[PDB]
């Protein structure tokens, strides 16, 4: 019950890291459009 519980928390943080990853790729895409 505790290993799976940690799994939910681990998957929870990895989801947010993705949101942050997406935001950084957007910036990179955006700067790229302009610099190009």
């Amino acid at each position: 019950a505790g290993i799976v519980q940690q799994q939910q928390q681990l998957l929870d943080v990895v989801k947010r890291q993705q949101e942050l990853l997406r935001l950084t790729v957007w910036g990179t895409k955006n700067l790229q459009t302009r610099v190009t």
């Binding site: 799976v4 799994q7 990895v14 997406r22 895409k29």
Partner: protein, 34 residues
């Protein structure tokens, strides 16, 4: 930059897929201990 984009766009979709299926296998394990 052409292939670059093509790659990050596929990775994004991939990850969302893994995250989705992970949420599934997670809830399966939740109701299982039960």
């Amino acid at each position: 930059w052409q292939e670059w984009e093509r790659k990050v766009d596929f990775l994004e979709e991939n990850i969302t897929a893994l995250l989705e299926e992970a949420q599934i296998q997670q809830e399966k394990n939740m109701y299982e201990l039960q």
